[model samples]
Every structure is written in C-alpha cells, then in structure tokens.
Target: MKLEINKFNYNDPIDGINVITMRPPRHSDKINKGKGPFKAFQVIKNIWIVPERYNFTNNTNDLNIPEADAIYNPNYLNTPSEKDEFLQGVIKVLERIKSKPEGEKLLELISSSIPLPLVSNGALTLSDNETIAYQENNNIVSNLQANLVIYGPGPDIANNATYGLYSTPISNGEGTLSEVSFSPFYLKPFDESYGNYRSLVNIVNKFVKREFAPDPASTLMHELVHVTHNLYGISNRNFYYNFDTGKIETSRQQNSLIFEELLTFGGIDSKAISSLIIKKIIETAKNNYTTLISERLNTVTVENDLLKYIKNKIPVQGRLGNFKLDTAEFEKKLNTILFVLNESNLAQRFSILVRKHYLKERPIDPIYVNILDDNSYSTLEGFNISSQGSNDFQGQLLESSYFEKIESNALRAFIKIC
Candidate 1:
C-alpha cells in the first residue's frame, strides 16, 4: 500500500514498487493480503499502584505502569527497589509472549522509565524508524513505547493547569500537509534551571485490579491509531476537534491520565468487542488511556488503505511550493488514503455504542473529558477530583477503579491472555 509515512518523495517510486527511498514492503503491494494484523503480541505484564488515600496528582490505575515497564528500563514506583521489581516483572511477561510464533521477535520488551513523562501534550517520543517497527509488530504485547514526543518540563506541582503537549506531521512545522510518524510522546528534560529532581519523594505498591491492567495497552493503541491516520489517512492535527471553539477535538495538544483511564472504561459498555477484539480492546482499555479518537479507530477496514475519494478540503493555501510535482495528481491519490483507513473496531464496534447508550445520545470530542484532572499539564484549575464534580459520567462512578485492587499471580501468561 502507498503509505503516507513513506511519501517523502512519492513522485519517484522505488524500482517497480511505489515505495519511497527508505524501506519498502517485502512482497507485492498489489497482493500483500495475508493473516491477521502484521504484528504479533506477547502478554503485557501490567501492574497498577494506587495510594490508600490521595488528594490528586494522577487517577487510579490511570497510568500504564506495566506497559511502561516494557518500553524503558524500569524506574521505581516512587523508589529504587520498586524499579527492579517493575523491570523483572515485565521481562517475565516478555518471555512468555516471545514463546509464540507471532511474538517471538519482541525486538525488546519496551517500557517507560517514568510515570507518563509529566507533560502538557502527552505525545510519544521515538524516531520515524521506531514508528515503522511498532506498526509492523502491531501485536497485543504493545509495550509503553510511544509515538508522540512528550515536550516541556519544570512543570508545576501547584494548581492543575495544562502546560505543554503538541502534535507533529499535523502541524508539519508550519507548512502544507505532509506525512510523519503516527504519533508519539517524548519526555524532554527542561533547563537545569527547572525543578530539583532530588527533592522528590518516592513510594510503590502493586495493588490494582487485574481487569484494569490494560489501561496502558489501550493508551498505546490510541497513539497507534494516530499512526494509522498519519500513514494511511490524514495527518491533520487540530488542538482538539475545534481550535476556534477551543471545544476539544483533542482538547489540548497532549494527553493526561484522565485520557487513559476513561478510554479503558469506555470498553465497559454492554456491546463490547468480540473475544478477540475484546481481548485487544480490553487490553487497550485496561491501561486507562484517552485521546482524540478517529473514524479509523472506530470502523474496521484497517488492514489496508481504503479511503474514499474526498475532495481536497485543506484550502489551496495560496498554492505555495516549487514546480516539483503536480498538486492535482497528489490530491487524487491523497483522497484514496483518507477514504480507506478504518476506525478502531474495538471503539467503533463497541465503545461508541456503549457511550451512546450511556449518554443517551451521540458522544462528543474527548468522550472522557475529565482530563481537566492533569495538574501537571496546567497552571490554572486542577483536572483531578473525586468524581464529585459536574462532568461526572454517572456521578461518583469514576473509571471503575479496577486498578485499586490487583494480584501478582494474575501477571502470569495463562491467566492474562488465556
């Protein structure tokens, strides 16, 4: 398929293949049809750590602590010993997953070294090369590795107010439309003039519910969906759905804990995915991730690019650029990409329906809007709360708190995937 990410120079197709100068698919693009997803997955060894009593910082099971383990070397739950346990635990899970044919080549059991890289925009941090690998291996064992690069730091622990988070390929560094990596978050260390890392307290406890372990899994899936969009669909990244209204297509440039938690909870509605999809969606949901979902993630025709021919909507923009290529021809191919990409079956087939039933109407941008809870992302009102506020899904019933209660034996492969 002609992927957007590989469109650095679509004008010049690679020998016999319509691929770019970089890497191209191995087989004939015309008939590359095969089995399930191009990727395989191992069991994700996830864990949740919630405090006995807390005011507000991050929500319960609202973080991808375990998947985080898979991406980067382990960091402590707040200390050193906890970090060791976190890493070892994830590796154990990695081994089990690699035992399968699809999962044997686990590149590396990816994990994060910190808790959500405290940022304004919760974008993932990785290179284009990294982006390709993840997509090729789109298995269930998705580790905490991200697609958006999390930016900004010296974040305030004060009142909750969004700080920073931005999108790429979408903005295209202020240029015409172009394809880029799906989406990822990079944790950029602010100037040494910022906060003192030495003054931080620490703690760790693995005690969340097994049902919620997939929150991080879902969060990764959310960004992965963005990847599919960038590569096959559109690379347009707005502040949310509407930048003018500031209403909330994506609400902000990045994501918050609220995004992760609510997404997982979205799966709870009655018409959930099939056992296979449910397995994936459930894993995606378990991590408690939330972000701007697209029709790509909602519908299911995802194996290949199948976008219908939609007219060029991105205004002529004065028709800039050189006389290198023909805009008319480019537009023709672009339309196919946009029309074909499908929405996530997990969400479209299930979550959206469940949400409609819950809301008694079609849902709006950011189905899980409590992201107002990310105190680190803001400098104004705090997004954190006890489910007592106005936007409560159904009053005191916040995210189901499946992470608040968990067990170690549950991390085993048979119990997790089976």
Candidate 2:
C-alpha cells in the first residue's frame, strides 16, 4: 500500500524539526484495513508510526500533536514536571512586576536591553519568540525570548549552593544572549536543606520574600539583570586595588549589588535611603580606622581628607554631600562608592595616606581590605576563586552583612537605571 505525506505540516519550535502528516492510501481497501482515520509523523524521506496516545486529532489530514508533550518530549523528558514548574514560577513573577505602579518603568528598562521589533508608535512589541519562551501575554517584556536559554541544574549547581546562574558567550565585548542554569531544588515544593525554592511575592507590599536567597524566580530575575547588562554592553567589572603591585585591576563578575537590592526592596524611599547608605559608609569607614586615626592624625583631619578623596574619585558629576537619588547619574555615583567600599583597595589607600601624613613607617602587609565586611571578600576576588562557579560570588555577597547594610528603598530606583 502507498503512503501519502504532507497533508499538513508543522515546524517544531524547539528543535526546528519538520513534521508532516501521513496516512495510508484512501482508495486501497486493504491499506489500513480495519484502522480508523489516524495520523502519523513523517520526515523528508522516512515515516514513523506514532502511537494513538500521542495523537491529538482524529483527522488523518492534520498533524495536531502537542509540541511539548509529543514533538519535544525527548529534549526535556527527564524533567518535564520541573520545567513546567519553573516556567510557571517565572510567568507569575513577570505578571506581578507588570501590574505594579513602577513596573512600567522597570519593564521599559528590561525591554530596552533586548532587541525587539519597534512598531510605528516606537514601542517594542512582543512576537512569537517571546510568547513561546515565556508563555505569557504580549504585554510583558520578554527576557527568555530574547536569546536567553534556560537549562536544568548541572554539576555547578550541586557543588555551589546556588539556585541559578546567568552566563554569556563573549567575554571581552558586547555579546549575544546566554543561558540561565537553575538548580533542581527549584523544581521541588520544599527542600529540607534549603526550604522553599519558589518565588514568594507579597503583592500588597510590593516586595519579594527572601529576595536575597536562591528563590527561583528572584534568582532568575537577578541573572536576567546580568543578561540585560551584557546585551546593553555594560560591563560588571569587579575593581580591586592590588596591594602587591600597587595598582588597580579589574575582573568581570555579575552586575552591581544595587540592582539586586532594588529587586528585593522596591517600595522604599530612594532619596532618604541613598542618603542613609552614604552616611553609613562614611561612618563605617571612620569607625574601621579609629585606632589608626588616634595613633597618627586627629579625627577631624582624617575625616576631612577621606571625604575629600571620595568626592574627587566619584565617577559621576556630583558632590558626595549633594547626593541626588533615583536618577541614572545618581545610581552610577552610589554604585561606585559601594564598589570602592566593598571591593576596591580604598581602605589600604586611606591607611597609606595616613602613614605618609604622620611620617610613620608604611605597613608591609599585602592583604586586601574590604572596608564594609570580610564576607564580601570572596565576591571581590573574582569568579574562579570559588570552585562552585560565578554564582557562588553572588550567593556569598547576598548572605553577607555588607549586603544587609546596603539594602534600602533607593535600590528599586536604581533598577530603572540598570
């Protein structure tokens, strides 16, 4: 008996497989014998009889098979339930962000990072690419659809105590969308060791619970921040002063802490919070070197000098005392100050300056000093320092007291700039 093909066709979105409907000759009584009207899948040169259970339509001319369950099951058969839960969790978070009062601005920043088609009105519109990846309505900005690939937990997750990681292909310059790997813990409802892995959003309060932890949706959001930065050609540089070489060096890491903090605490007052953070850093710095100041110079001289140094070194066009908050310029200035406090050798420089002023012997110790806290030392060290990979740095930073100190209302405002 002859077989007819291409009565209907479908291109599998996941793998681009050409699947065509096929059936036995309708004129031949012996062909298909007692079989009722059914459909089969055929490639260009071969035919495969699909089981009746895989069939979604009785019409022999239509190849109405479920894409996820039938055509692409082989790709993620090992974690079907897990993938479904992960996707659902992400969709819910996106929807919540979209419904917020400030969500439009936040989403506009997200949408600007990726390449989307511009309509006549100059607004970006979602296409099939976004609809498939996010499985959400068109109104939402699409991250997964804009060149981001989602993968299951690999060896990195098992070793690193992290929920998710975002990576890119190019290292030196602007690159394409990369992948976000999520831990299996995100799939389960609750893990005895990690507690809940899913995102818990307090819609009424406009905050995410345990935002700093490895909660899947928040984790994905954090990684996407890195992804967006990469797309926008923004480098997440970890700047450090090398005591051994007496020079400043840089390495790549995830995005700045302000963005993550913003995602965690979005409903606070940006101006007051930014001022509080700035005050805290200066106070913390003075307190950290109290003994040194007493031994060398007076408190007034040391504090005045330190403040002068900070105002001079700030990257943006603003005085340290005249801190304006919630704008892109203000965010850049604040992020630089935090980086200097937590990652760079600002402490060592200040100490050296004090010794020089008092005509005292320069300390020979080559150790790096983070003015805020020691827990952040791991993150300042760069990615390869930890065996668990880049995500380890993020996990360490979030769990540190330094991150706790930096958390405030202005963080949400910084998200608009990031």
Q: Which prediction has the highest TM-score against the true structure?
A: 2
What is the Cα-based lDDT of residue 53 in candidate 2? 19
Give lDDT per model, in order: 0.23, 0.28
Clashes of each: 81, 1
Deviating ranges (above 4 Å) for candidate 1 = 1-81, 84-168, 173-216, 228-234, 239-343, 346-418
Give the Å shift of residue 213 in candidate 1: 8.4
> On a 0 to 100 scale, what is the lDDT of residue 157 in model 1?
10
lDDT of 1: 0.23
lDDT of 2 by residue, 1-418 (tens): 2222222222223221322222222213333343323222221111122212111113222322220101111222134353344333333334433333233233344333332221223223433322122112223222223334333333212111111112221222222343344432211111112222333564434222232322233333434444444433232333332323433235422322333223222222222234544454444333322322233222222234223432232222333223322235434643433332210122132111001111112221111112222233221332113444433223322333332221112211101111
Off by over 4 Å in 2: 1-77, 99-107, 115-145, 156-175, 184-215, 237-248, 251-418
Q: Residue pairs in steric clash, candidate 2? A: 262-411
**lDDT score of residue 234 within candidate 2:** 32
